[PDB]
Amino acid sequence: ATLCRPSVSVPEHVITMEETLELARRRHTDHPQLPLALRLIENTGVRTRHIVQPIEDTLEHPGFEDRNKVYEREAKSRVPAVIQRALDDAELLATDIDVIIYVSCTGFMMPSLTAWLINEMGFDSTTRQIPIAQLGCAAGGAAINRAHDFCTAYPEANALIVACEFCSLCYQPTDLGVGSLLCNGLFGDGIAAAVVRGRGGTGVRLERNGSYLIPKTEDWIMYDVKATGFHFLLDKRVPATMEPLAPALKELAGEHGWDASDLDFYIVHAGGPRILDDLSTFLEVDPHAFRFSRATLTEYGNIASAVVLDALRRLFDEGGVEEGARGLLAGFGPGITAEMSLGCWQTA
Amino acid sequence: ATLCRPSVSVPEHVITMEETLELARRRHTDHPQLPLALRLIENTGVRTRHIVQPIEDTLEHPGFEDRNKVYEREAKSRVPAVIQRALDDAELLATDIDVIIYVSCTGFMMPSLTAWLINEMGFDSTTRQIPIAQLGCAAGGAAINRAHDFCTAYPEANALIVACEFCSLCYQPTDLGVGSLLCNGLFGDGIAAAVVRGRGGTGVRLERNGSYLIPKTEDWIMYDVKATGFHFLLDKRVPATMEPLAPALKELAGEHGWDASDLDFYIVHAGGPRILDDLSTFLEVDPHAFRFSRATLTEYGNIASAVVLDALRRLFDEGGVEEGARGLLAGFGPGITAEMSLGCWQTA
């Protein structure tokens, strides 16, 4: 199985770094840790982010019920187009996909969108649905690792990975801790869809994938679930966790031969360049390695599960084609979990 | 791969038909359709149901935040014990497990409980985790199929399927419709766990699992997501859906040479003797083939995704199974979805 050209699309409402600082200032003028909050946000290097609703509406909280209503409306009117362009690239019709893998942690619906997608997109009335809402920033990589595992089990199988993240719909005016303030300047909205044809595609070439859970960090990247919806909690110690994770990247990187970090491919998702830079040290590649990841964050912000996919999408546009260059696709999030994936680039 | 003896545990707080009727009467004394409602409940044949909190606590709504806290505590103090027995029956320690497929739709947490399990359960730091919360009553079957597919990709793989459901945590005093009144008398709480060994083990051997999605029935079995949590919506037309679904079973049965509509081992979960009977006619078989499912509903009520597993548990306990006898495992839920699985019995 080979990962094809991920298709990505973001909403039309844009919020700049400068604007974020203004709002944060005006909205927290009395906050005792305000200067610290603003500095942290600015250092993030996130110049722009996109949101599905105008800024004045996203700042308001009409309740979880209305927020979640916005979630399904915006996903129904936006997801379809993206899935399309993802089929066109992998060169398949709705009917060549055996399994849909829908990941989103920014809203909740049962059934998930997969059912409505099969109905409207004219998918196979037999397509398997695999909705995962509990893996957050790591869901991107996990989707890959699944579409992969699936294909190996059914060699002629094509999987459709769809990532839909409207992080702006999880904004909680009530969360006043500096961590919250940070997060409010970092996450954005984005949608990604990529096909993984095992038949023989053009993109990253499947090899060996693997998971890794950082012991006792369960509550380090999590959701507090309240009447107001999902409140995101990110422990101050998250970046430092890069040290314990580096080895897990090497351990698996080894059990494939490509072994050494000394690779040509690096598409990893880490929230903010801070955490991404601890990975460019503890691992010992080079900062510049995660040029594509950092590019998504700089222009879109942290769009959760969709980051990996958009990084790839950017690796295609610059598309050199180093042909068979190594490869390390990884996602990090709730767990703390790490969905790592090793693969070679394949042309055809 | 072979499905092993699923362990099942239900909470100690019991609620009978009689008291359910009494509560419904006492609380909806003025409901215009109170008579219809009581007859309907009494007609489901659900003698008893098990809940995690005493009935007095179950009936009050302390809010979604608290309700969800109750979900977490209860899952932590009850799931482990049940997983233990499942590991023991399949005969193994937490370390032969290559993945955990966690299904639950009656509460929400991120990360899901698999992360916490991996740690306290002393599980293997590299254990894959597939949590699915948006498949409802059909999640039990979906989990079996996913454990399957995995054991295919990795023959030496041992998958752990956990189904935790505390439907009582989704009780909404404010839902007054007759459908809601009915559900309040049908759903119960229960935890299931089973190991799917690609290698050894005694139980039902894999051999062809498929899926089907009844067209244009997305809002027929769904959740309304509000500040109070999840409000369950079941359309009055669901039992009738058994007509269009029966052919979906035969259709996939023949693809394995065993359709004809006459297997030697039936374990399907529809959602009430209502739906079950329609199935035992459109599939043209005697309702007695579903005796295992019916027993679960009669004794535990509708424990959502855990039903198929506890149904299988039923079969094991009675044995007498033809070591070679054909079989069927299926779950029905939001979609409307149908996760099916064909397989023959087997012994070590």
Residue B112 has a CB neighbour count (10 Å cut-off) of: 28
DSSP B155: T
Instruction: Say how far apart CA A122 and CA A23 lie, in whole Å.
Output: 44
- Give the distance from CA B264 to its chain's centroid: 22
> Smallest CA–CA separation between B60 and chain A, in Å?
16
Structure tokens at B340: 């099916």
Test the A interface: residue of B127, B129, B146, B235 with most A CBs within 10 Å: B129
C-alpha dihedral, B119 to B125 to B128 to B132, nearest 10°: 20
Q: Maximum CA pair distance of chain A?
A: 60
Instruction: Give the CA distances from residue A73 to residues A115, A266, A303, B91, B231, in Å, rounded to whole numbers and listed in that order.
Output: 15, 35, 19, 48, 19
Residue B294 has a CB neighbour count (10 Å cut-off) of: 19
Structure tokens at A83: 């899935």
Instruction: Say how far apart CA A283 and CA A281 lie, in whole Å.
Output: 5
Instruction: Say how far apart CA B332 and CA A266 lie, in whole Å.
Output: 42
Contact state of A129 with B227 under an 8 Å Cβ cutoff? no
Contact state of A63 with B223 under an 8 Å Cβ cutoff? no
Residue in B125, B211, B212 nearest the CB of A212: B125
**Residues of chain B contacting A223 with CB distance shorter than 8 Å:** 108-110
Instruction: Say how far apart CA A78 and CA A82 lie, in whole Å.
Output: 7
**Residues of chain B contacting A220 with CB distance shorter than 8 Å:** none
**Residues of chain A contacting B105 with CB distance shorter than 8 Å:** 110
Q: Which residue of B has its CA nearest to A332?
A: B111
Residue in A65, A125, A225 nearest the CB of B109: A225
Residue in A110, A119, A131 nearest the CB of B223: A110
Experimental method: X-ray
Domain ranges of chain B: 1-202, 203-348
**Residues of chain B contacting A110 with CB distance shorter than 8 Å:** 105, 133-136, 222-223, 230, 334
Instruction: Say how far apart CA A46 and CA A40 lie, in whole Å.
Output: 11
Q: Which CATH architecture has domain B203-348?
A: 3-Layer(aba) Sandwich (3.40)
Contact state of A225 with B129 under an 8 Å Cβ cutoff? no
Q: Which CATH number fits domain A1-202: 3.40.1710.10, 1.25.40.10, 3.40.47.10, 3.40.630.30?
A: 3.40.47.10
Say whether B203-348 and B1-202 share the same fold: yes
Contact state of B149 with A153 under an 8 Å Cβ cutoff? yes
Residue B235 has a CB neighbour count (10 Å cut-off) of: 15
Angle of helix B307-318 versus helix B291-300 axis, rounded to 10: 120
DSSP B105: -
Residue in B153, B221, B228 nearest the CB of A149: B153
Could you tell me how many residues make up chain B?
348
**DSSP run (H or E) holding A99:** strand A99-103
Residue A286 has a CB neighbour count (10 Å cut-off) of: 12
Q: Which residue of A has its CA nearest to B339?
A: A128
> How many beta-carbon pairs under 8 angstroms link A with B?
162
* Direct distance between the N- and C-terminal alpha carbons of chain B, in angstroms, rounded to an integer: 12
**Residues of chain A contacting B221 with CB distance shorter than 8 Å:** 111
> Smallest CA–CA separation between B177 and chain A, in Å?
19
DSSP string, A195-225: EEETTT-SEEEEEEEEEEE-SS-TTTEEEEE
**Residues of chain B contacting A337 with CB distance shorter than 8 Å:** 111, 115, 129
For residue A206, the number of C-alpha atoms closer than 13 Å in the C-beta half-sphere is 21
**B134-147 burial by CB neighbour count: b if 16+ within 10 A, else e?**
bbbbbbbbbbbbbb
**B236-254 burial by CB neighbour count: b if 16+ within 10 A, else e?**
eebbebbeebbebbbebbe
If we measure between CA atoms, which residue out of A311, A345, A303, A289 comes closest to residue A194? Answer: A311
Q: Which residue of A has its CA nearest to B226?
A: A65
Q: Which residue of A has its CA nearest to B69?
A: A225
If we measure between CA atoms, which residue out of B88, B83, B269, B77 comes closest to residue B162? Answer: B83
Asked if B139 and B305 count as a contact pair (C-beta separation under 8 A), the reply is: yes
Structure tokens at A117: 């997608």
